Design a protein around this ligand. Sequence first.
Ligand SMILES: CS(=O)(=O)N1CCC[C@@H]1CN
Lengths: 178, 245
Amino acid sequence: AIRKKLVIVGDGACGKTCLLIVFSKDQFPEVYVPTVFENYVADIEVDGKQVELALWDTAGQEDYDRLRPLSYPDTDVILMCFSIDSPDSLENIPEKWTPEVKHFCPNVPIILVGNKKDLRNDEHTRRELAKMKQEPVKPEEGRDMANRIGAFGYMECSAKTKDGVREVFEMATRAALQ
Amino acid sequence: SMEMDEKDFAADSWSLAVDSSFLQQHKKEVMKQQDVIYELIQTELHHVRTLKIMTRLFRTGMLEELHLEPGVVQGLFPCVDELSDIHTRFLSQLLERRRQALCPGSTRNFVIHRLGDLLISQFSGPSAEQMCKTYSEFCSRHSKALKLYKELYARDKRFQQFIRKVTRPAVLKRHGVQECILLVTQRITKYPLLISRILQHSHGIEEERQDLTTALGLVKELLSNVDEGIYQLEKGARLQEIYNR
Ligand SMILES: CS(=O)(=O)N1CCC[C@@H]1CN
């Protein structure tokens, strides 16, 4: 199996740590959801090809501009995350996260991922956002942002229900192989 | 890691580590607090274990089996002895706090009520100054270590055989040389995440809430100082490239 490296980036409230935990764990965390993620090396077979995909989180490095780039050397695929319950997390994608990743990871595919898709139809979420003249991110808003930033593709998932999680990591593996 | 500590931290949480009849005696808020303290100690035990892989398996194995040119092993594993001393001492204090809290007749049932004071001590005075100096040096030598490793693996057959041999076992799957270096660099930025969540569940005793608030502030001051002290070293960098930063 060939070895590839994946790094997930995005704002503190984007759900990147939860996404890595849910994908890497054999059983969904029903008793305790970990606060942090160390690393993991996933065995993935996508389109007949076997890959060892090393997974890394940038959680905790958002405020540290000289420590954070140390996560980027030899990255093969970037997951660039935002939360669907946070239009603010999507606004920070084009002029903060995108120029950074393009500088430190030139020519590395970026997949834009809309996390927490289950909250798009959550009434508590819609009520809270409506107080700030906002609403959950729409699918076309995510696709348009991915198109604008030069992303390899746009995908959505829910770490809570696991829907779409396997597909995100299988596609990230295909992107890393290209 | 030693078997006694691995077994004490084998469970996914504190609520699964203690006896169910002991868990039933506590309120939900205490269980949530203890689950996060358990995660801080469990991840510290794994971080010390990563440092032992670097010093004992890789570094010492290269010195005892390979003919590397002088200063090559120090370049691959910068500051590892200092990092091991800092974290082994911290882990010893965390495990002694847990051990003193065990119920008589038990090796697994405990509640840690006073973590804040231990964290203030770790992240203040000489031990904090040493952590700041060591991580500023380590993180500035991180890129150079990765490049030195890649160069040796691509050009030296005996180095390649040594690496493939000692990283073959399944227990080393996540702990190759480059993975260990990044695990160490990322450790320091995990502390505020863990301390903030412990604090969220430590409002019951005002002295404890205050001590964890002070500890969180000290950790952030340390990280800010480390981040400000980093400038990546590059082998063969010329003075002109440096003074034109
Ligand atoms: C060395 S440090 O980063 O931990 N730092 C913070 C407190 C005091 C000291 C500065 N003099």
